[PDB]
Structure formats: C-alpha cells, structure tokens
Amino acid sequence: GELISIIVPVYNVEKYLKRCLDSLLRQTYKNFEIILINDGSTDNSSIICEEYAKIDNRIQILHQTNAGPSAARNAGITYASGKYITFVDSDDFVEEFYLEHLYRALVDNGSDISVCNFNSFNEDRQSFLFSITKEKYFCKNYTIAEWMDLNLFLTFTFSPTKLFKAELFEGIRFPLGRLREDDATIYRLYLKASQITFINEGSYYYSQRDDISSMISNAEERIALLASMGYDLTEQIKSYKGRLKKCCEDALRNGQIELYQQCCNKLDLIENYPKE
Amino acid sequence: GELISIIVPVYNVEKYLKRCLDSLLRQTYKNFEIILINDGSTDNSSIICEEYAKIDNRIQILHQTNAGPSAARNAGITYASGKYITFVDSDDFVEEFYLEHLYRALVDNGSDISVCNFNSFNEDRQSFLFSITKEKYFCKNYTIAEWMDLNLFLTFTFSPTKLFKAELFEGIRFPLGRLREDDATIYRLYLKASQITFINEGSYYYSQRDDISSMISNAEERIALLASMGYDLTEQIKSYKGRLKKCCEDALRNGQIELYQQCCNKLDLIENYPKE
C-alpha cells in the first residue's frame, strides 16, 4: 500500500505514550511513517520518543521548542511525505486493524477522506466504554452536503479517526496558539473533498480522565464560509445558539466580561429579536 | 423636544475640535447634552474641552486614561442621560439643522432609529465634495429586512449620522482595543429596531485628509447572527468575499502571515470548491 503519514504531537504524556506507540507499531497496514513531534516536553516523553525511534525506522522524531498543539501538528504536516495523512493523539490508542480499515474504505470507494468512530477508555476505572457495537456497524459514502448535515465532536472538533489525501492540505494549517484548533480546521479539509466515506466502528480509543472565545469565533467563521459556498446552515445555526448559551454563562463565571457582554447580546438578539 | 445625548470621543484633535464644537453649539435643536470623552489627549485637546465647558452648560467633560475609541464611546453611553443617543467624531462638523432633521424623521414616523447621509470636506484643498445633492434628496421608512439588504460604509461601519433610541443600547457596547469598532457594533443596534427612517441629505461633513483581522471576523460574526435570525445573506456574502480578497493580499504585504494563510484558504474554498 501507499505511504500513510501518522502525525503524533507529544507533550508531557509519559504515562500514556508507550501504550500509544505500541498500538501503532502493531498495525496490520505496514507502509506508514510515524512523525512524533515532541513539543518541548519536560517529563520523560522526549526520552521515550528516542527509545522507540531506535527500534523502528518508520518512526521520525521532531524535537521543537514548545509552541502548542497547532504548531506541533503543522510541523507534522510539513514533514510528512505520505500520500495520506492521519492524526493520532499520544493520549490514545488504536486497534491493530485501524489503519487498514481506514485505507480500504478510502481507496475501494474512491473517496478523498475516510472517517471512523471511536470508543472510550476510562483511565480512572481502567474500563472500556463500547458505545459503538458491531450490531450498529455501517459504512456509507457521502457527498459534502450530506456529510455537513448532521456526534458533532467526532465530525468537526476531533482531528483523529480520519484519513486524508495529502493534497487536501494545500493552504490548510491549524491556527497558532489557540485551543479548539481541530474545531477550526478539520471541516475545511472536508470542503476540499468530493466524497467522504464513513465507517461506524470504534477502532480508535479515546482515553478519558476551556477556550470560550474560540468556541464562538470558530462557529461564526464556519457559518460564514458554508453560507458563502452555498451549503445548508440549519444544523450549524443550532450548534451556534447552543455555544452562545454556554459562553454567556461560562464567560461570566470566569470573569471574561467583554466576552460575556458579546455572547449575551448575540443570544438576546437571536431569541428576542428575530426577523418579522 | 426630549434630551438628545451627543457622544464625542476626543483624542488629539486640537486642529479640528473647535470647528466641531462650534457646529454643535449652533444646533437649532436646543435640548441636548454634549459628552466630550477626552481619551487622555496629549496635545491641547483637553484644554480646548475645558474652555468650551465653561461657556455652555450642555457640555459635560469626561477625562479618562487613554483606552481607545471603543472605551471612549462606551463611557459616553454609560454617562448619557438622554432619551436618544447620537455620535459625532471630533474631526468632523455638521449643518445647523442636523439634529433637528434627524429628530423629526424619527419621531414623526414612529421609528426607533433615524439615519442621514454625509458629504465630505477635503482638508488638503479646503473644499467640499457635495456627493449628496438636493435633487437626489429622499426620505423613506424601512423594515429591518429592507434596511439590511443594500454605501455599506455609511450604513454599517460609520457610527455618526444616526439617532438611536437610548433603550436600544441594552447589552450593546463597542469591542475594546479594536479598530473597525463601528463595523462590529452599529448593525447590532439596527437589529433591535422595528423601523428605520433614512433621509438622503448630506448634513454631516466627513473631514478627509488598518485592522485586517477585525475586518474579516466582524463580517463572519455578522453573517452568523443574521443567518441565525433568518435575514437574507446575499449582500453580506458579497461583502465578505470582497474583504477576503483585500485581506489575502494586504496581510501578506504587512507580514501578517497566519492571517494571510487563513484568508487565502477561505477565498480558495469559496471560489474553487463551491457546493456540487
């Protein structure tokens, strides 16, 4: 198979990194590179990275001065030479057939992107939560319009579980210094695609154990773009109202007063002054 | 007539302030207060303010530590006790019948807001440009939907030439530390109104002699709000695409590289990947 680039930002994850890398080296799909971007870790993460690189030549390390998750992923994208690009968080781990299933689903269907689901692992209790069962398995091709019309966490705000043609990344980078960076970026990759293939399997495990401002501005930017391109807004509008409610209260609790002012005003307009 | 609050931010306008204030004290509509917000001027502006306060008791001065145009206007809004609120830039000046015409247009039509046009004065050549002639005069009542469907400078991004019921300002303030603050605020006041009256007279004179980021996020925010409230997006979408073009090139010229990738990417999507 053609080369897949796995981009893995690493920042102070010494407890979890070995589990992650072991689950990647066990992939049944062999032709990958793993790009570990150590974002200036101050625990043993950087050492663990070096140790794994010494026993598998598919692992490439980039050490860099701490600059945040966006900067780490953008470095991953710049360094990747694969035909495909996928993201794995160093907190998490995957089934041994993860990559292969994503690959087949993309190539056999002629899609530009393939997406699977995830299950969770509760670290506090050391137990899986299998929300996605075999009985609920399905696979499906989508147009972009069908894809954009929906969880919203899996789809828009979570960068892993997805396999991207590398050419999609022309002009697309994660926004610097900001959290909710996936939220701002992943959907722009969808808008580049012609067809997206989804597989409802939980092959990625999300280990389980805020940036209000970005939450709001990401939603506004996404709505403006979709509108300018002629996509339907119904769901994005509901999402936006929901985020405004959360912001209006949480900004106040955090003492983010100008943000509070803004969000309340916006929520006041939508609810009490709609068009007549 | 009921009290009109005229909010006038003052920052280092010693050359122009006397002209502005003289044109205001000559108003045929007498029942106003002028709130001068000296935003920590370092020329003779603050002294000129004090001199005028001594000969007309309708003038109230607020001195404050320099905090920007938004902070100055927000201070004006907080201190205003009028039933109506209007803005005058200290750079500019008005006809003697300016306030009266705005007042009548609002009250006689039962509107929540009245708006007039402006002409310009070229300071370098000391000459008027009468774009708005008497032969092109008209007056008209508008719904918000009719109003929102258009210059765009006069309407959305320019805070003077408009008379607002004071009640409209519940929850509405100019955004701190940002330029294009008018761009972000004025239209939110329109959305509070039931009916807007426009008078096509150039009774305000704009004296004639950048914030790329805000330009873009203001447009995205406005589109998201309007969409959420059910208004039409056609013109805003055209406005947005135009600002992206300007941003894509100007951000690059200024060395604003992350902003440049963002705007190019957005413009690339809109023009080369519209919905299929």
| Cβ atoms B166, B176 nearer than 8 A | no
Partner residue facing A217 (CB), from B175, B217, B229? B217
Distance set, CA B197 to CA A90, B105, B147, B150, B217 (Å): 59, 6, 9, 15, 28
Place of tokens 């689903």: A105
> How determined?
X-ray
Chain A window 131-160: which residues touch B at a Cβ cutoff of 8 Å? Answer: 143-145
Partner residue facing B188 (CB), from A175, A241, A265? A265
Nearest to B236 by CA among B157, B119, B175: B157
With contacts defined as CB-CB under 8 Å, which chain A residues touch B217?
A: 217, 220-221
Q: Dmax over Cα atoms in chain B, in whole Å?
A: 68
SS3 B217: helix
Which residues does chain A break after (C to N > 2.5 Å)?
A: 150, 209
How far is the C-alpha of B50 from the C-alpha of B88, rounded, in Å?
Answer: 18
Distance set, CA B16 to CA A90, B64, B203, B210 (Å): 61, 20, 18, 22
H-helix or E-strand containing A15? none
With contacts defined as CB-CB under 8 Å, which chain B residues touch A220?
A: 217, 220-221, 223-224
How far is the C-alpha of B91 from the C-alpha of B77, rounded, in Å?
Answer: 19
Measured between CA atoms, the residue of chain B closest to residue A224 is B220
Token pair for B254: 């200024």
Sign, Cα dihedral of B72, B180, A247, B80: positive
How far is the C-alpha of A119 from the C-alpha of A205, rounded, in Å?
Answer: 5
Sign, Cα dihedral of A11, A6, A206, A23: negative
Contact of A67 with chain B, judged by CB distance below 8 Å, is answered with: no
Nearest to A158 by CA among A139, A185, A132, A177: A185
| Cβ atoms A120, A208 nearer than 8 A | yes
| Quoted resolution (Å) | 2.4
Nearest to B174 by CA among B62, B267, B28, B68: B68
Amino acid A21 reads: L
Contact of A257 with chain B, judged by CB distance below 8 Å, is answered with: no
How far is the C-alpha of B114 from the C-alpha of B57, rounded, in Å?
Answer: 26
With contacts defined as CB-CB under 8 Å, which chain B residues touch A268?
A: 170-171
| Cβ within 8 Å, pair A173-B261 | yes
Chain B window 185-204: which residues touch A at a Cβ cutoff of 8 Å? Answer: 188, 191-192, 194
